[PDB]
């Protein structure tokens, strides 16, 4: 079949992709170096820096949340099982590290038919680690739109129209808003996200970001992981 030396053409990848509008996203699915960064200037303006958000106080409570995940502060919806019909390409999930979830039947069994059977699903249901699986996940809509689930994210309190829901490490804004409590996806801090192959695709405005080796702890254990920051 079609081969580009790897990372996305495996029996367990849901290749249910509709580029009827001819918006070139299939080139990105097939070449990791291909991204579409048009419209990134506008989109980034709506994303806010952490200082502009209200400070947080009291206990932290969990929250349930929109349409675009490009911002570090997007409040993901908690993960569930999604039908393979609605996914194009690989689905990446973040331990904090990048890990790939493949197509399965409704009972966790591995299925090898490129998400073509209607039984085929992506079971992305999450409990935060260490006693769990991953903090969040990110894939592509069958029509080329990035989709992120994760959490449940964090309410840190605060008052105003500037109040913040933390899906990352927000220790400045609240000392208990640490990734191990509040992480809900690939955003390690407000300024950094986990580096994986289809990151230029899923998050195309991180293209000028620089890659660093970063170090973090989850529940007192250490992960050394490459991530992109700017």
């Amino acid at each position: 079949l079609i081969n580009t030396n790897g990372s996305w053409h495996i029996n367990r990848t849901a290749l249910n992709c509709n580029d009827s509008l001819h918006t070139g996203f299939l080139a990105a699915l097939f070449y990791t170096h291909k991204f579409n960064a048009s419209g990134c200037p506008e989109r980034m303006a709506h994303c806010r820096p952490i200082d502009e958000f209200a400070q947080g106080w009291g206990p932290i409570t969990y929250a349930e949340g929109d349409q675009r995940p490009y911002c570090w502060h997007y409040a993901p919806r908690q993960c569930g099982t999604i039908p393979a019909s609605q996914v194009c390409g690989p689905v990446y999930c973040f331990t904090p590290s990048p890990v790939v979830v493949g197509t399965t039947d409704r009972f966790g069994a591995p299925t090898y038919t490129w998400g073509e059977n209607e039984t085929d699903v992506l079971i992305l249901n999450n409990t935060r680690p260490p006693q769990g699986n991953w903090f969040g996940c990110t894939w592509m809509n069958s029509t080329g739109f990035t989709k992120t689930c994760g959490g449940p994210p964090c309410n840190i309190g605060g008052v105003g129209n500037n109040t913040l829901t933390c899906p990352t490490d927000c220790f400045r804004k609240h000392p208990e808003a640490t990734y191990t409590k509040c992480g809900s996806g690939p955003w390690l801090t407000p300024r950094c996200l986990v580096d994986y192959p289809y990151r230029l695709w899923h998050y195309p405005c991180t293209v000028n970001f620089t890659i660093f080796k970063v170090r973090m702890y989850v529940g007192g254990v250490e992960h050394r992981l490459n991530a992109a920051c700017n």
Partner: antibody, heavy 129, light 108 residues
């Protein structure tokens, strides 16, 4: 994973221009620092220059502003251009990637990079009139 | 520009020898020194960065110590895989400059 496949050159003559490419296999070009280094034959290493993740370049003044480094994001390509070539410029040319800087998440600070961890096998440029 | 020198130019060793070679700098380069190995016809390999930190996949035989104007690379027990020309590089200032190399060869 990341590899550097380097593409060769032809015979050059002085006053000509040189253009050499290197294609990043194993991963994208993004987020990395890339540099060009040359070794005259029998001699040792000289740093031609660098490109930062957002396109900005730094060049060695010993090239007398006759050198250009670039990245073609459309084809995953790293290029080196050297105008007004002289027989002095006969050397092996290497593409290398900077070692990813260490980043402290809390301080949001890192050392700016200068070590080359992946190197392309290098390719000869002979320049004689 | 910062001038990098090395001693010795040529060292003749045998397996099991501890080899120590020094790099020196015209101006203080702090810790921003890297050490590379190059075997003939092949590309340079990174061994040390930050003058003490060892890049992954290179063995513990290789040690780096130094600061300011003087730095040093050492093999605790040379092995046949360790005969090459060894180079130092500052990344303190632009232009990034290299040392002229130290060749370690077989002893007979």
């Amino acid at each position: 994973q990341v590899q550097l496949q380097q593409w060769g050159a032809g015979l050059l003559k002085p006053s000509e221009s040189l253009s050499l490419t290197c294609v990043v296999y194993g991963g994208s070009f993004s987020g990395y620092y890339w540099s060009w280094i040359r070794q005259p034959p029998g001699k040792g290493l000289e740093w031609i220059g660098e490109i930062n993740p957002t396109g900005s370049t730094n060049y060695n003044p010993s090239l007398n502003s006759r050198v250009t480094i670039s990245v073609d994001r459309s084809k995953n390509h790293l290029s080196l251009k050297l105008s007004s070539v002289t027989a002095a410029d006969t050397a092996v040319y290497f593409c290398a990637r900077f070692l990813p800087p260490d980043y402290d998440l809390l301080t949001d600070y890192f050392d700016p990079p200068g070590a080359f961890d992946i190197w392309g096998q290098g390719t000869m440029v002979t320049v004689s009139s | 520009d910062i001038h990098m020198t090395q001693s010795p130019f040529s060292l003749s060793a045998s397996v099991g020898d501890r080899v120590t070679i020094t790099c020196r700098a015209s101006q203080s380069i702090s810790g921003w020194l890297a050490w590379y190995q190059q075997k003939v016809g092949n590309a340079p390999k990174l061994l040390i960065y930050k003058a003490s930190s060892l890049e992954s996949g290179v063995p513990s035989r290789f040690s780096g110590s130094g600061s300011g104007t003087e730095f040093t690379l050492s093999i605790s027990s040379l092995q046949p895989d360790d005969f090459a020309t060894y180079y130092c590089q500052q990344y303190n200032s632009y232009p990034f400059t290299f040392g002229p190399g130290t060749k370690v060869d077989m002893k007979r």
